[PDB]
Design a protein around this ligand. Structure first.
Ligand code: FES
Ligand SMILES: [K+]
Ligand SMILES: [Mg+2]
Ligand SMILES: [Mg+2]
Ligand SMILES: [Mg+2]
Ligand SMILES: [Mg+2]
Ligand SMILES: [Mg+2]
Ligand SMILES: [Mg+2]
Lengths: 216, 113, 170, 294, 126, 50
RNA sequence: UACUUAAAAUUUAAGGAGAGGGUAUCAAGCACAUUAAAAUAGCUUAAGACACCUUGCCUAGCCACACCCCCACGGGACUCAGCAGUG
């Protein structure tokens, strides 16, 4: 070969483009700004889904609650209106770290960290909180923490083993007879190893994407 | 001690040049089937080999071992062995010096020199 | 008339008659033979008749031949471990040479059959697709199944053109 | 209990192989198929005899008898009855496991009916779908029309019984009712018309003689073997009849008289032969011809 | 094409002619065309009843288990086929759709009975 | 009434299917290990050397 | 998709047993080598280098292209080589 010539401009463009992105990164106060009259984000002109309109006008964002508290509410408990309606058992975050967006003129946008207690079961380590820019958060009062966080676990009643599908059960029993294993035991699937979290369970904010800085 | 990627882990060839420092240019030949004629001909390839001791001479048959990491752009083999030295061949079967199809030292004798 | 002596050597059937399939260890086979002499006649016949057959079945093995370098002919195999297997073929017929190398460094018939079956594992007769890869392109070819509309027109009630007319009529 | 002899018992196969016979000209009769130019080799008398031996070895493999089995039992097993799916489908689904390395009699072929019952495929469904996904040269997905009684009678008139059976082996399974029906119909027509020679030196002779022995109607085959001077075969047939019916009057009579050779056939005539009078007449005439001429 | 991202999936690739559909069950990278490059063919589906009135599904259950063990997703039509066979449980929407059909036929039967009762009133009027 | 019944059907269906995907995931790895380092694998390797 | 550690699908980078269009009136290319005290003067090529011309190929499909400037920071003559349609 050896006629594949070098492409200096292409290499220059890639680097130059990447550099500009780092320099002109947007902030939470800009990406997540909202126009409440039209419920449309100015940065991208994305209109929020219809099912979110009522809460955007009726509920507060997390750092709107925390900006009014000393130390940005470190140690306080915060729950979500969606959890309160969906789950009877206590669901909340125990705040541990909070990085407000200083650029915001009301310090109403930022990031937070805490320890999750979902449906009465508590995680062992603190991680970043997702959906901090949602209009769904409710600060728990200090005097009501004891009654709010009181939970008694019920004995688990979800089945631990189930039958095999009709064809897959016949193929298992047939193999037994072929191999000489004589038994009338019913093949049973074990569901303990593979139990699914609820669909609304908090997800990992650290591995989540962030929107780009090109305005629409 | 992972081995080389190159297909030619072991190649035999003739030292066709030795003018580079510590490197011997070796010409290997393989048999390739002509599809039209269905006859085998000799396809020859050049291999640069690391001759650490500069113990190679033009015309001698040598064995090359693929280096684990390519030493340079073209040097990807080393000199494993000199199968036949040019003009100084030693018969493998009997072990006696030979000069062509003849014995410089008779196999009946036991010089042990 | 096909050119050369013994033109049968240049036929695919002759090349495929070779029976020496070397083990994966074998990498090189140097052939040292003499063009003149009486004790090297079998070696000369081995280079003439057998070296083509060996190369055909072992395309990745380097066969390099040297002439009139030693008093007697021999074969030396170079293995991947670094071992060198020297064979002395003087006073030996070309057929005897082939049998000797087959025994010491040749794959057994059992091993070769196993490799053949493994190669075809992913071909299934039931699979449908192009003729290059499959027996039947479509299920219409099978007997008892609905035939291809091109060969046999489908019933009117099985046609989208007809069904659309009814939906409009409804 | 003394085991009932089987078709594949080494003793039965010996007798059945012997009475069948061998004829290299009939076993290797030229096939009406696409032809190639013949090849020629110069051979000595030693080499020629070696080649005839190899031909006889191949003729043995060619004459290997096809299995004689009992009729399979209908498959009627319900894996599940999901009534939620009742009325949601109009046509049956047939699901076939087509993993290559499963014996065909160990594959799972299920049917989801419109009612919702998940059941195992019947024998007819099993054979049909295995032909669709593992096609066998000679077999057709749908049963051919040559096996109808009118069409089969046509083949019998042309003395094509060995083909009717060669076709029945390519199409049907040995344990199927269709297989047994066609074979038992061919064997019965040979009997009535005494066409036993058609299946000699063929793989179908053993099953025919087996069928006659089990059905206690070897009389015709004995009369035919005797008239063709094959009286060593006839004696072996009476031994096979005395082996599969040990408690029969004929088998007990041969033990009392320690009969052997031609005596065994005479014992059969008096005791258990449906047409004993003819067996003796043919046997007597054979002895007269053999004695008179030699 | 040189895909970036995606996962292996088991899906139905449509073949046949116009008004004569036929499917090949295949394992293929999800970004590939419906009838294009695939990894393995895992069976076939003939959705038209044959002479015996049977829709014929072929499943290579040995290879299907292999690719589900390696992360292969399943298309919703393929999940329905595996449920009908008995190899998988019946899909939630197979059950719901069967229930919706039952409630819809009950209404039709009731309406026909009401119409017959209305027709009976017409008979009473004479 | 139908949304809740269907939501639970999906949860139980997806749990059963996750248990089967795990069982299939183990058969793949068992078969692979037997081929790579099974009894038969080791014997043939030494038999060749001998 | 699994585990706190492993099975796949799909790619990328460095390579090479062998194979791979035309013109030899394209016969020389001109740094195209090795060593690793920094010296040696080498490397490719009639077994076809180099130069030029033509062409999608490897066909369950693959490769390249996406208004133009091979690229696309930039600049410019500023977008249907998506479906239908027009000059
Ligand atoms: S090719 Fe099968 S339906 Fe036309
Ligand atoms: K371009
Ligand atoms: Mg969500
Ligand atoms: Mg000119
Ligand atoms: Mg461009
Ligand atoms: Mg254009
Ligand atoms: Mg465009
Ligand atoms: Mg267009």
């Amino acid at each position: 070969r050896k006629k594949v010539r070098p492409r200096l401009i292409a290499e220059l463009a890639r680097r130059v483009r990447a550099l500009r992105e780092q320099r002109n990164q947007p902030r939470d106060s800009q990406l997540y700004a909202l126009d409440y009259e039209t419920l449309t984000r100015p940065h991208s002109g994305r209109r929020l889904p219809v099912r979110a309109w009522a809460d955007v006008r009726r509920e507060s964002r997390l750092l709107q609650l925390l900006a009014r508290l000393p130390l940005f509410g470190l140690g306080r408990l915060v729950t979500r209106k969606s959890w309160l309606w969906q789950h009877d058992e206590p669901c909340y975050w125990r705040l541990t770290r909070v990085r407000p967006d200083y650029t915001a003129q009301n310090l109403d946008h930022g990031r937070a960290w805490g320890i999750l207690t979902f449906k009465g079961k508590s995680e062992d380590t603190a991680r970043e909180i997702e959906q901090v820019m949602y209009h769904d958060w409710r600060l728990v009062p200090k005097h009501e923490e004891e009654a709010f966080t009181a939970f008694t676990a019920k004995p688990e009643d979800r089945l631990n083993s189930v039958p095999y599908p009709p064809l897959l059960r016949a193929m298992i029993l047939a193999e037994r007879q072929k191999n000489g294993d004589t038994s009338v035991q019913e093949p049973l699937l074990n569901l303990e190893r593979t139990r699914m979290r609820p669909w609304d369970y908090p997800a990992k904010q650290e591995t989540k994407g962030r929107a780009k800085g090109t305005p629409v | 001690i992972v081995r080389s990627s190159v297909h030619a882990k072991w190649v035999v060839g003739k030292v066709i040049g030795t003018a580079m420092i510590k490197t011997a240019k070796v010409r290997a030949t393989r048999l390739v089937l002509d599809p039209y004629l269905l006859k085998y001909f000799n396809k020859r390839k050049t291999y640069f080999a690391h001759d650490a001791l500069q113990q190679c001479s033009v015309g001698d048959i040598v064995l090359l071992r693929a280096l684990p990491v390519p030493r340079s752009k073209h040097v990807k083999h080393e000199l494993a062995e000199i199968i036949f030295k040019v003009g100084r061949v030693i018969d493998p079967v009997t072990g006696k010096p030979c000069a062509g199809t003849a014995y410089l030292e008779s196999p009946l004798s036991e010089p042990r020199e | 008339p096909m050119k050369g002596r013994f033109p049968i050597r240049r036929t695919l059937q002759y090349l495929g008659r070779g029976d020496v399939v070397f083990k994966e260890s074998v990498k090189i086979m140097t052939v040292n033979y003499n063009t003149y002499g009486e004790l090297g006649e079998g070696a000369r016949k081995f280079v003439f008749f057998n070296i083509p057959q060996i190369q055909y079945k072992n395309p990745w093995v380097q066969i390099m031949m040297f002439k009139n370098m030693t008093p007697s002919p021999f074969l030396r195999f170079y293995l991947d471990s670094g071992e060198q297997v020297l064979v002395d073929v003087e006073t030996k017929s070309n057929k005897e040479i082939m049998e000797h190398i087959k025994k010491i460094l040749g794959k057994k018939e059992e091993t070769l059959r196993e490799e053949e079956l493994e190669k075809q594992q992913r071909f299934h007769p039931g699979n449908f697709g192009p003729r290059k890869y499959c027996l039947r392109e479509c299920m219409c070819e099978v007997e008892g199944q609905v035939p291809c509309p091109g060969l046999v027109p489908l019933p009117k009630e099985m046609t989208g053109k007809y069904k659309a007319a009814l939906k409009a009529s409804t | 209990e003394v085991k009932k002899p089987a078709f594949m018992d080494e003793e039965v196969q010996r007798i059945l192989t012997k009475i069948t016979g061998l004829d290299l000209q009939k076993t290797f009769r030229p096939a009406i198929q696409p032809l190639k130019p013949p090849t020629y080799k110069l051979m000595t008398q030693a080499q020629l005899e070696e080649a005839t031996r190899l031909a006889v070895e191949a003729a043995k493999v060619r004459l290997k008898m096809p299995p004689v089995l009992e009729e399979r039992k209908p498959i009627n097993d319900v894996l599940a009855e999901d009534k939620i799916l009742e009325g949601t489908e109009t046509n049956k689904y047939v699901f076939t496991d087509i993993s290559y390395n499963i014996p065909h009699r160990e594959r799972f072929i299920v049917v989801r009916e419109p009612s919702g019952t998940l059941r195992k495929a019947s024998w007819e469904e099993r054979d049909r779908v295995i032909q669709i996904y593992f096609p066998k040269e000679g077999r057709r997905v749908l049963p051919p029309v040559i096996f109808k009684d009118e069409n089969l009678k046509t083949m019998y008139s042309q003395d094509r019984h060995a083909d009717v059976l060669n076709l029945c082996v390519a199409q049907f399974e040995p344990d199927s009712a269709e297989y047994i029906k066609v074979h038992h119909q061919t064997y019965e027509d040979i009997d009535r018309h005494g066409k036993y020679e058609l299946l000699r030196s063929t793989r179908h002779f053993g099953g025919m003689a087996w069928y006659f022995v089990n059905k206690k109607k070897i009389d015709g085959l004995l009369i035919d073997q005797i008239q063709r001077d094959l009286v060593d075969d006839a004696t072996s047939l009476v031994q096979l009849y005395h082996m599969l019916h040990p408690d029969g009057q004929s088998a007990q009579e041969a033990k009392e008289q320690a009969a052997e050779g031609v005596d065994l056939i005479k014992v059969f005539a008096k005791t258990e032969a449906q047409r004993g009078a003819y067996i003796e007449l043919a046997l007597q005439t054979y002895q007269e011809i053999v004695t008179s001429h030699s | 094409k040189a895909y970036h991202g995606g996962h292996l999936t088991i899906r139905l690739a449509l073949g046949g002619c116009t008004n004569r559909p036929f499917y090949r069950i295949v394992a293929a990278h999800n970004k590939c065309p419906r009838d294009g490059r695939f990894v393995e063919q895992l069976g076939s589906y003939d959705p038209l009843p044959n002479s015996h009135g049977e829709k014929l599904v072929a499943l290579n259950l040995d290879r299907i288990r292999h690719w589900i063990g390696c992360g292969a997703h399943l298309s919703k039509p393929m999940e329905k086929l595996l449920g009908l066979s008995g190899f998988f449980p019946l899909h939630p929407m197979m059950i719901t759709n069967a229930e919706r059909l039952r409630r819809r036929r009950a209404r039709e039967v009731l309406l026909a009975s009401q119409k017959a009762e209305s027709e009976a009133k017409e008979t009473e009027a004479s | 009434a139908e949304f809740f019944v269907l939501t639970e059907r999906y949860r139980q269906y997806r749990e059963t299917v996750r248990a089967l995907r795990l069982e299939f995931t183990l058969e793949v790895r068992r078969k692979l290990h037997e081929a790579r380092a099974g009894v038969l694998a080791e014997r043939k390797a030494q038999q060749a050397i001998t």
